[PDB]
Symmetry: C4
Subunit: 95 residues, 4 copies
């Protein structure tokens, strides 16, 4: 459960690293903005304060969403049910 | 079921209070706009009428989404299946 | 299954009617824009071409999302698994 | 499992082709922008860099979201659990 979470954590980080490199390079964003935009994209928030301006960027974003959404939300789910929930229950009973 | 819903309700409120304080303070939003933005972020609507302008804000928003989405949608689900649904079924049969 | 879908269909329509009336009135949108915005909000797309400008509107939108998301996506799911899927399978076998 | 994925893949492509044609034609987008916008809409990212300006476009987008979200996310799920996951597990054991 903990190994599941480790793996999804690593996969998420690698996905976000890929987006940070791509958007910093092709769309010219500061690395911090590239990471932020990658996260806002794959969690489907999509503020649109950054959005790809190049056709290269738009095509990559299509593929990045389709490949990355499933991973991000798998990690969010496991983080919910395997880390946050136990800590919440545990806080419910003094020791 | 009702205690489950109570807990998720409290956790959601606390999460939204955290975002309201942070965005009011660091991003200078009116408290009402900070709450509204927090909700629009964690439900993944993301209009982008407010979005963080500071690097502090962008980093916090990354973490806030990852930690908060799972909680908000747990609460929405329980609110759907444990409160709204019974009332809907109950309205279906006169008394 | 068909009655389930009927009910969720009616509930969705009523929810969207509520948003259309509210946003047309309080935020001054054309009714068509109010419906469009209501749909874009509750499906969490959130383009932000329309977003509430009044505090009344922002508070209503907070509550509307929390109460309406669960309903809309229940309807989308049932529409997926109970209407679209059978028609797709049925198209797979000539008659 | 592979046939399931094939079918959802074809259905997704057809849905995106429909949106590309419609938005290129009625909203005057370049085909590439129409595809990009279709994807950003049905995955619920919704940057809003493109959004429909015509009433025809707004009405179509309402219907497109309701009919298309369920399909897209079915495909993303199957792509997650039926293609990405096995490859990830398989990379975990040298051969
Ligand atoms: Tl958005
Ligand atoms: Tl937006
Ligand atoms: Tl979303
Ligand atoms: Tl969104």
């Amino acid at each position: 459960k903990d190994k599941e979470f480790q793996v999804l954590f690593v996969l998420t980080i690698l996905t976000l690293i890929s987006g940070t490199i791509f958007y910093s390079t092709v769309e010219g964003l500061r690395p911090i903005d590239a990471l932020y935009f990658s996260v806002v994209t794959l969690t489907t928030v999509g503020y649109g304060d950054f959005s790809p301006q190049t056709d290269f960027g738009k095509i990559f974003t299509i593929l990045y969403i389709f490949i990355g959404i499933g991973l991000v939300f798998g990690f969010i789910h496991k983080l919910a049910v395997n880390v946050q929930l136990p800590s919440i229950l545990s806080n419910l009973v003094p020791r």
